[PDB]
């Protein structure tokens, strides 16, 4: 039969199904394309349990009271937490800007960990639960008036009907969302501790040609790489103080869409042990988070060991997690690209991921063009047969 015609800009395809794109095989053919599974939305009430595979499917889940509202329970649910405490990553979440607001209604994203390799996601967006005193969200004065109620009867403004399904079960977690409301208008009142030092293509001082840049204090083992959909950075480091949570953040705005233009490095220092401190060099090559470690004298005299890591975002994932104490691997600087180059060649995630980005940096303007801009930054490739 001859072929359907359908726009481009909008494809729906049902599940266990495919859909066959017809091309012109004179021209070149560059698809740009993004992928959001359909929302399930749910507005019965009463108790509402979903497997595992039944929130693993779902990547936005809506809750839409029509009389009443569900008790929202995710089973198996192993949230990501990088602080132990319970009252610190709250307000770490609050701060990434996984608190969302517009409206009347309240959106909070999550993550868990999965069997399979990265760390997953999930947004619950709870529509009715705001009141009509806050339908007039545009103006920064009403909601700043309002704040104020937030903190001590925050029961005062959420829906009737949402009153007694505040909390969402998480397997062994429960997670009240009135708390989660009541500490995003703190966090937006301080915005208008977490310690804040954005970075941008011109700041920082001037191998490592470019800038360098320093955080405020020294930091713990562990890393956290945050990468929101608008695709701004937020590089979560920790204060190496148990006495006092602290985590301050790197921002870098607007990433995904001006990684060409970051030639920045960023210095740190993990204290040890053993009363030895060990540097640590962060540099940002696209997506792929290059991380060089540098014992300076810890242990040997004017030859410090340098070792060399790196993680990279692969499969739309916007959060990762490196933890430097338990797992990884020693790799020198000649090690560390030869094991780049091996990875490049068998097709891994990475590289897939680091071609994507490139493509997508080449076509800035509009019109295809590898400018100069990015024939530092990209290292050749040659295959030959002898």
């Given at each position: 039969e001859p072929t359907v015609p359908v726009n481009i800009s909008d494809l729906s395809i049902p599940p266990y199904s495919r859909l066959y794109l017809i091309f012109e095989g004179k021209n070149n053919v560059l698809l740009r394309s993004k992928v959001h599974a359909a929302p399930l939305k749910i507005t019965s009430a009463g108790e509402m349990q979903l497997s595992e595979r039944q929130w693993q499917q779902q990547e936005h889940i809506i809750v839409k009271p029509d009389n009443e509202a569900p008790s929202l329970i995710l089973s198996e649910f192993r949230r990501f937490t990088i602080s132990s405490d319970k009252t610190f990553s709250l307000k770490l979440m609050c701060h990434q800007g996984m608190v969302r607001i517009d409206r009347r209604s309240l959106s909070v994203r999550l993550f868990y960990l999965r069997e399979q390799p990265g760390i997953g996601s999930l947004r619950l967006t709870f529509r009715d639960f705001f009141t009509e005193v806050m339908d007039t969200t545009d103006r920064e004065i009403l909601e700043k008036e309002l704040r104020p109620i937030l903190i001590g009867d925050t029961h005062r403004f959420i829906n009737a009907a949402y009153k007694n399904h505040l909390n969402i079960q998480l397997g062994d977690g429960v997670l009240n969302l009135a708390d989660i409301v009541a500490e995003y208008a703190r966090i937006q009142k301080e915005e208008t501790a977490i310690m804040t030092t954005t970075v941008t293509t011109d700041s920082g001082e001037l191998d490592l040609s470019g800038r360098y840049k320093s955080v405020p204090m020294a930091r713990k083992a562990d890393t956290l790489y945050h990468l929101t959909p608008k695709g701004d950075?937020?590089?979560?480091?920790?204060?190496?103080?148990?006495?006092?949570?602290?985590?301050?953040?790197?921002?870098?705005?607007?990433?995904?869409?001006?990684?060409?233009?970051?030639?920045?490095?960023?210095?740190?220092?993990?204290?040890?042990?053993?009363?030895?401190?060990?540097?640590?060099?962060?540099?940002?090559?696209?997506?792929?988070?290059?991380?060089?470690?540098?014992?300076?004298?810890?242990?040997?005299?004017?030859?410090?060991?340098?070792?060399?890591?790196?993680?990279?975002?692969?499969?739309?994932?916007?959060?990762?997690?490196?933890?430097?104490?338990?797992?990884?691997?020693?790799?020198?600087?000649?090690?560390?690209?030869?094991?780049?180059?091996?990875?490049?060649?068998?097709?891994?995630?990475?590289?897939?991921?680091?071609?994507?980005?490139?493509?997508?940096?080449?076509?800035?303007?509009?019109?295809?063009?590898?400018?100069?801009?990015?024939?530092?930054?990209?290292?050749?490739?040659?295959?030959?047969?002898?």
């Open positions: 950075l937020q590089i979560i480091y920790q204060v190496a103080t148990k006495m006092v949570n602290q985590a301050m953040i790197v921002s870098l705005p607007n990433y995904r869409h001006e990684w060409e233009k970051y030639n920045l490095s960023i210095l740190s220092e993990i204290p040890q042990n053993n009363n030895t401190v060990v540097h640590s060099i962060l540099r940002v090559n696209g997506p792929t988070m290059q991380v060089r470690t540098i014992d300076y004298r810890g242990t040997d005299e004017n030859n410090p060991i340098v070792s060399f890591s790196d993680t990279t975002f692969i499969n739309g994932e916007q959060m990762l997690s490196y933890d430097s104490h338990s797992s990884g691997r020693v790799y020198s600087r000649e090690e560390y690209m030869m094991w780049e180059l091996q990875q490049r060649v068998s097709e891994a995630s990475s590289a897939r991921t680091q071609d994507y980005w490139l493509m997508d940096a080449a076509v800035r303007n509009g019109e295809w063009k590898i400018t100069p801009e990015l024939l530092r930054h990209t290292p050749g490739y040659i295959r030959s047969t002898v």
